[PDB]
């Protein structure tokens, strides 16, 4: 997260870190056994880390649970990032509490101008690299589809939206991928891609979760 702020320990209780010996992506807890992340985050050997704040120090409240299933959307395209969504089933159920909590899925899509909370442990610099210990947060609005397509001509599908700031300085970044965009208490987006981070005229692009609510439900019910 570039141009954000320290969230505060456990103030985003649905945020998870996906770890393979290091933090590599975010995700969102949607029930005690399932996490939503980005398809581009798929790999073998995922450990889901819940209840995290400082990802480099064991502080209390953490639950580390291996992924038992990682299900990329069948129509995920690794070149366009269309359908950039994955479900992870936990090997055992997380213990839910005030610091480890699910986030609701949308019942309808969000409109342009809706303010959302985007969070992660990704890079905090628009040029070069700095990875934070603690979770960072950014409040950002959903942009109009016209503005999104103007910024990314030929690259925005019906399964994407833009959020953030055209003036530069505030965005998600590498290491935030897979993490949440929450708006009025619903998980409306997944950190997906963009042209650099926090660059002028190049807002973040996010997977449009409202298009996948039925797919998520059917996939969980069958697994």
């Amino acid at each position: 997260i570039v141009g954000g702020y320290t969230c505060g320990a456990n103030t985003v209780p649905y945020q998870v870190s996906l770890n393979s010996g290091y933090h590599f992506c975010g995700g969102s807890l949607i029930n005690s056994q399932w996490v939503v992340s980005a398809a581009h985050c798929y790999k073998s050997g995922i450990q889901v880390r819940l209840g995290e704040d400082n990802i480099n120090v064991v502080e209390g409240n953490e639950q580390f649970i291996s992924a038992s299933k990682s299900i990329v959307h069948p129509s995920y395209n690794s070149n366009t990032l269309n359908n950039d969504i994955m479900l992870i089933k936990l090997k055992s159920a997380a213990s839910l509490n005030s610091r480890v909590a699910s986030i609701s899925l949308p019942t309808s899509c969000a409109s342009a101008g809706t303010q959302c909370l985007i969070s992660g442990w990704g890079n905090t610099k628009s040029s070069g690299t700095s990875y934070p210990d603690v979770l960072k947060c950014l409040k950002a609005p959903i942009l109009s589809d016209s503005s999104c397509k103007s910024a990314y001509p030929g690259q925005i599908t019906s399964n994407m939206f833009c959020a953030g700031y055209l003036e530069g300085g505030k965005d998600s970044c590498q290491g935030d991928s897979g993490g949440p965009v929450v708006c009025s208490g619903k998980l409306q987006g997944i950190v997906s891609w963009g042209s650099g981070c926090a660059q002028k005229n190049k807002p973040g692009v996010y997977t449009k979760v409202c298009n996948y609510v039925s797919w998520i439900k059917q996939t969980i019910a069958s697994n």
């Binding site: 980005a38 581009h40 990032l81 950039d84 990704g122 990314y152 690259q155 998600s172 970044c173 590498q174 290491g175 935030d176 991928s177 950190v191 997906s192 891609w193 963009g194 042209s195 650099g196 981070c197 973040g204």
Partner: peptide, 4 residues
Amino acid sequence: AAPX
């Protein structure tokens, strides 16, 4: 453009 790159994944995040």
